[PDB]
Every structure is written in C-alpha cells, then in structure tokens.
Amino acid sequence: MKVRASVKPICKDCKIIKRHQIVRVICKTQKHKQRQG
Amino acid sequence: KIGNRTITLDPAKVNLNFQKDHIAVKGPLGQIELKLPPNLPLKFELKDNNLQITRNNELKQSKIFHGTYNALITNAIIGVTQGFEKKLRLVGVGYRANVEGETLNLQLGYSHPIKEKIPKGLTVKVEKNTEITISGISKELVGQFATEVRKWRKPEPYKGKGVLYFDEVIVRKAGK
Amino acid sequence: KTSMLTKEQANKRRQWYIVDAAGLVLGKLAVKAADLIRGKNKVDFTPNQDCGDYLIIINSDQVVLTGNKKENEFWYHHSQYIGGIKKVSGRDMLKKQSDKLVYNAVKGMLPDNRLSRRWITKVHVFKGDKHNMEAQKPTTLNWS
Amino acid sequence: GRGFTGAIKRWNFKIGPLGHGAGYPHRFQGSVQAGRGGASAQRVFKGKKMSGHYGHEK
RNA sequence: UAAACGCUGAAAGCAUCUAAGUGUGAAACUAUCUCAAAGAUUAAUCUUCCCAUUUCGCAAGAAAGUAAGAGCCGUCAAAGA
RNA sequence: ACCUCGAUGUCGACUCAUCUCAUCCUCGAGCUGAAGCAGGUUCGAAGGGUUCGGCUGUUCGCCGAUUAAAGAGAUACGUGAGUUGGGUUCAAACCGUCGUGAGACAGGUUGGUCCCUAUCUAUUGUGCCCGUAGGAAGAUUGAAGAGUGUUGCUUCUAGUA
RNA sequence: UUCUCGCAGUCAGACAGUGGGGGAUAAGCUUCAUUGUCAAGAGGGGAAGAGCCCAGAUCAUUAAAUAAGGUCCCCAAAAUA
C-alpha cells in the first residue's frame, strides 16, 4: 500500500502481517493500510 | 493449544487409510483425499474414538505443522461430517441472480450479464434471486468460489450494493 | 637438470559411460562430470594429448536443486542484438531445456582452451533414456 | 527483385530541405554515430537498418 | 505472471493470500502473426539417384576417373553492379 | 589541475536513433475529504507513441491552436573521416563607453572559404574455396534469434445505473 | 654515518598508514612532519593493478622447508565436530 520506510501502529487495531516476506499493516480503516517498513 | 489438543473420532462410516504421503478418509460426505507433504514431520497415532499427533523432532516447520496438521484434520472431519456452507446476499435493485445447471448467470450494473460455472464438489442453491447458498465438503474450495463470485460485484461504502458474505456491517459513506 | 618427464603420445582412447541425474545438484555433479570428461581423475593426464572419456547422460529433466533457486535464481545469456539478453529460471529449464542447461553449466567450468572446445562436445546429453549411442556398448556407472 | 536498393526506399525514410545550399549529399543513412571513445559505444551496433538487395523474400 | 485481489491454514487455540497446499490477475515476458535457417563444427535428420569395368603401389585403384550431375560458352528474364 | 594540449573540432539547425525509468498517455491494481462524471493519490509497469505554426542565431524560452498525452535523462552539452555554418571566436566598419595612444568591451551592429581516391574492425546485403566424411539432388526438424507488438472517434446497450 | 680530495647527481615527486591544516575529518585534492614502497628493484597474494600484504632475484635444476595467502571446479592445494 503506502510507500514508507517504517511502520507504526496507527490505532489499536493495526495488526502487523508478513505476506510473502513483505511486512504490511492491516486495520479497520482502508486508509490505515501501509507498507514498506 | 492445538498440538496439545486431541479430537475424538466417530467412525460410524468414517475410516482412515494411510497412503504413501496422503490420507484417505471415508465418511457420510464422499471421500476426502488429504494432501500432505511427503516425509511428514508429524505422526498421527489414531486409536479408537481418538487421534493424537506428535512431532518426532523440533523444527520451526515441524512446530508450525504441530498446529497446522491438527487444524487441517479437524477441519476435514467437520467437513466430511457436516460440510461447509456459506450464504451470499446480492443487494441491488437491478442486481439479480439465477442458476441453470452449473451455469450461474447474473444481471448487474454492467449491461453485460455475467456467467460462471459451479465447481465440481460444490452445490449451489439459489433459494431467492438475491440469495445464494454454497455447500461443499471443503472450506478452501467454497471460499475460493465465493471469491470468484464476489470479484464481479462488491459492496460499496456510499450505499450497500453488491455481494455481502451473508450481510456483514460495512462502513457508511454519503454523497448527493 | 631435467628428468625428461614422459607421458602418453597419441595412445588415447575415450570410453563411453551412462549416467542418470535425478537427485544430484547441478554444481557438485557437474564438477565431477567435467573431471571425468577431461580425464583429470586419471593418473596419466596429458594436456598435450587428450585423456578423457566419453559420457552419456540419461533423463536430465529430473535434476533437482536446493532451495527456491528453481524459481529464485536466473541465468542470463546475451546475443549481440537489442534485447538479446535471455533470462531463465530453474523451473523454465525443467520445462524447456534442462539438457542445454546442464551442458552449458559443465562448459562454464571448462578452461579457456582449444581442447576444452573439443572436449565439451564429447558428452551426449539426453532428457530421455533411449539413443543410438547405446549400440556403442557404454560402461554404465554412477556418481559422476 | 528490386536489386541494389537505397536505404531511403528500403526503410522508407524522409529527407529534409534541399534549400539554402545544404551541401551535395542528400541521400545517406543519416548519423551512424551513437557514441565515441572507449566508454559509451565505440562502434556500430548489430542490427542496424542499412540498404542492400531488396525483394526476393518469401 | 509483477504489483494487486484470494480460499484453507498455523506459530499466535482468535485471526492471517504463505509458511505446506489451493487460485485469479499487467499495453511487460514465453508462444501463437511474419523472416529465417545444421559453419546449429551443436557440423543433425529423411528421401532419391550413380556405380563397385580383370587388375598395383608406404594400405589399394599406378592404370579405363560415371551410367548421375555440375562446370566452361551462348540465348536470355520474374533475375540481375 | 589529470592519460590528452608533435590537435579529443565545437553552439545550434536537418538526418539516424537507441537504451533506461524517477510513466506522460495507452495496461492493471489499491485508498480517498472517490453520489455519478471529471478526479487526486501510491505502486507494478519501458511494448508503442507522445504535434504544428510565429519570434529569438538562440538549444532553451514565450505565445496561439490541437490530441490521450504533447514525459525526463544519457550516449564527447551524441551525431562534419553524414550537410550547413545562422550565431559563435580572423582581420575589415560604425555606434555608446573606456584608455589621451596603439586598442578594448563578458556590448550591439554588416558580411566574412569547413580537406579527403575507405587500410582494417564493427556493421547491411551478395559471392569464392573447404567443411557438413563415397559422390550427386531435393525436403526438412529446429539450434539460435530477429521483425512485430500504435491507437482515436461515433452509435447501441442507455440518459441506464 | 669522521675529515680531506676527484667526479657527481637531484629539488616538478607520487602513493599507502599515523598526527594534522586548508578544503567539508568532500575530492585518486593541496599543504606539512613521521613510518615504508616505487622511483632507482623484480617476484607471489591482491580478478587482472608502482607505491597495499608477504617479501629483496649471481646463473642451472623436472630438488626440500616455507611467508603472505589459499584448498568444489576452472586452478596445484582437508577434513572433522
């Protein structure tokens, strides 16, 4: 999703997943999705 | 947990057969062919009315499989004894569904009607023009088929219109 | 001064063998294959002549590899044209050309040599099992 | 068979103005220079559109 | 197949497109459209024709060098400096 | 302050373009302060293409019109042993200034000479000898690659959602 | 490595390390002092490399111990846990 250099817990529902060696964050909001940790 | 959890067996019709690297299960719902990797890190000691699994060594792959295989066997048992069922709700005034044989056809926001084929081993029941009931013996296939159905139409946040996975709550948006 | 070290003088002869590659990895099989082709393992090695032996490979389509290099590793080859680079993966070679893959893999460890040019062609690579070379009565062996 | 054709016709190229006295040569392959020196191109590359025998092609 | 969207599914009893398994999906890529071709020395394959004119040499035709074909020369063109 | 100044010729204009992506459009996906439409947003993404005219010697740059767009770099500020020198940087002359004076202006102003019979490699076509294993003639597999992979408008579905 | 005598030669050094300055503890840059090298002296390691490491070559050896360094193959050179 979002291009960054790190990932942060945006809210209390921001789980951290590692799909295909790619670390992303999943949360309630579709704007709460980031990438590139 | 899961590796420490053991599940009983009800072999009224269900019986187990050890293949070279697979498992053959027979029960009320067809025959189940459990595909497992060769040289299994886990060992599934099956007794009367009980099954217990354990790994011969400690490996991260083996540690993962300690729960993975147990969950997979439990899901296979519950599927063969009861099946996996899911309801899809197609909400929309012009969004209508019906099924003829294996060919399910939809009238949607697209002017082009969309046709899809029912996969083998899964049964589709069109109880209502806005309701679909998928009933299989494997959760993987029914989930994948539900995704194949929903990829054509998905609910919208401004106004619920699309294929809900049995009418979940969605984020409400607005605009005039 | 000198001891006049003497070696073979055109007394060479190459012996045909049969090998199957199904479980060996590419590099550690190819090194010994090259050593057998050049006759390195023999004691009467002569570079002024040839001292290797013939070799025929059977069912090269079943060669396996460690890790995900079948899908992770890629091999490049450039032809002198725009876009002449061809990039291949391990699984593609198992699908299109494994015999050529192993052939060039063995050729890559060969020295830059006029005889190695005439040595790489001495191996007969087949992804099957039947060929006219069986009439030569090869000495079937393994671990090459 | 068109025999010894021209690159202007073999490749169907375009020639600019002939006014203002722009020298005698007007039908040539254009600039064959891509790079010079032992750092950028140093040569003519393979696969270059050039004239020759035209026709007699199945 | 990339990104991306996934199902089951653990570590993490929830959940998870990934870890095993199971998919979809890009004007890019391997093909299918066209060119071309074994000096592809990696020298390949198939078919067809010719004949072994008694008889030698450091290994066999010194000597009759084809019954097959090609070449030299001319007419030329759908060719073609 | 360097291999090069017993010599690596340039600014630009025309021709040849190529490659790459930090993609402009065409391809795809996701989020929205994305009702629709028109979007913004981040990425994968290099196959193709991305205008014309006026002025400036001017590349550039400004303006007008047009498409979906009029993307960005590199290749000696690519490209004369492919063309031109318009400017530029020979003397020649004037204007304004400076030096008193020869003169100078990183000012303008006018014109003001671009050499080549191709040795080799690469590179595009076509032949000669040999190979392809008795000689000759056809037909091939395909080893290897190469060309090619642009795209707009109108109508219907439908003024429908 | 003292003095005298005769003949000189060189000042356009560079590199690597240390301590620096300037530059920006940018520059294979400049300025310095010091420690070594090439210049003026080759060789092995370093993928090929003047200044790095090991090292200082009368000549012939188809003799041995080695240094740096290296031991899957190209390419001599090992294995066990």
Please give the single-letter amino acid code of residue B119: P
G35 C1' to B132 CA distance, Å: 88
Chain D contact set for C80 (CB, 8 A): 46
Q: Hey, what are B58's tokens?
A: 């400690």
Tell me the sheet residues that pair with B24.
B17, B33
Q: Both B72 and B128 in a single domain?
A: no
Evaluate whether residue B5 is within a structural domain.
no
Of B31, B48, B82, which residue is a domain's last? B82
Q: Give the phi and the psi of residue B46 in degrees, each rounded to 5.
A: -105, 125
Chain-centre distance for alpha carbon D40: 21
Domain with B24 in it: 15-82
Q: Both B58 and B115 in a single domain?
A: no
Evaluate whether residue B173 is within a structural domain.
no
The residue that minimises its CA distance to C1' of E24 is B148
The Cα-based distances of B126 to B87, B104, B148 in angstroms read: 10, 9, 16
Please tell me the total count of domains within chain B. 2
Evaluate whether residue B2 is within a structural domain.
no
Q: Both B154 and B93 in a single domain?
A: yes
Q: Assess whether A30 (CB) lies less than 7 A from strand E.
A: no
**Is B76:B70 a contact under the CB 8 Å cutoff?**
no
**Is B25:B76 a contact under the CB 8 Å cutoff?**
yes
Evaluate whether residue B3 is within a structural domain.
no
Q: Both B62 and B98 in a single domain?
A: no
CATH number at residue B114: 3.90.930.12
Of B31, B49, B82, which residue is a domain's last? B82
Which residue in the block uniquely carries the two structure tokens 């060969």? C110
Of B47, B82, B117, which residue is a domain's last? B82
Evaluate whether residue B6 is within a structural domain.
no
Residues 6+ apart with CB under 8 A from B134: B85, B86, B87, B88, B122, B123, B124, B142, B145, B146
**Chain C residues 115-144 with a CB less than 8 Å from chain D:** none
Residues 6+ apart with CB under 8 A from B26: B13, B14, B15, B17, B32
Q: Both B95 and B161 in a single domain?
A: yes
Q: Both B50 and B90 in a single domain?
A: no
Q: Both B53 and B40 in a single domain?
A: yes
Long-range contacts of D2-10 (CB under 8 A, 24+ apart): D2/D53, D2/D54, D2/D55, D3/D53, D3/D54, D3/D55, D4/D51, D4/D52, D4/D53, D4/D54, D5/D51, D5/D52, D5/D53, D5/D54, D6/D51, D7/D49, D7/D50, D7/D51, D9/D54, D10/D49, D10/D51, D10/D52, D10/D54
* Resolution, Å (one decimal): 8.3
Alpha-carbon distance C36 to C51, whole Å? Answer: 9
Evaluate whether residue B175 is within a structural domain.
no
Q: Assess whether A22 (CB) lies less than 7 A from strand E.
A: yes
Judging by DSSP bridges, how do beta strands C123-125 and C55-58 pair with one another? parallel
**Is C87:C100 a contact under the CB 8 Å cutoff?**
no
Rounded to a whole number of angstroms, the distance from the CA of D19 to the nearest CA of chain C is: 37
Greatest C-alpha distance within chain A: 24
Q: Which among B74, B59, B58 has a CA at the least distance from the CA of B2? A: B74
Q: Which among B107, B99, B162, B159 has a CA at the least distance from the CA of B134? A: B99
| Touch test A–C: 3 Cβ pairs or more under 8 Å | no
Chain C contact set for D45 (CB, 8 A): 82
Q: Both B55 and B95 in a single domain?
A: no
Q: How many CB pairs under 8 A join C and D?
A: 5
Q: Assess whether B2 (CB) lies less than 7 A from strand E.
A: yes
Render the burial of C38-67: b for 16+ CB within 10 Å, e for the rest: bbeeeeeebeeebbbbbbbbbbbbebebee
Evaluate whether residue B115 is within a structural domain.
yes
Judged by a CB distance cut-off of 8 A, whether residue C83 touches chain D is no
Q: Both B23 and B51 in a single domain?
A: yes
Please give the single-letter amino acid code of residue B69: Y
Three-state SS across chain B?
Answer: CCCCCCECCCCCCCEEEECCCEEEEECCCCEEEEECCCCCCEEEEEECCEEEEEECCCCHHHHHHHHHHHHHHHHHHHHHHHCEEEEEEEECCCCEEEEECCEEEEECCCCCCEEEECCCCCEEEEEECCEEEEEECCHHHHHHHHHHHHCCCCCCCCCCCEEECCCCCCCCCCCC
Alpha-carbon distance B130 to B88, whole Å? Answer: 8
Strands (E), chain D: 3-4, 53-54
Q: Both B23 and B89 in a single domain?
A: no
The Cα-based distances of C130 to C33, C57, C96, C114, C125 in angstroms read: 20, 10, 19, 31, 11
Per DSSP, A19 falls in state E
Q: Both B67 and B130 in a single domain?
A: no
Q: Both B89 and B161 in a single domain?
A: yes
Judging by DSSP bridges, how do beta strands B96-100 and B31-35 pair with one another? unpaired
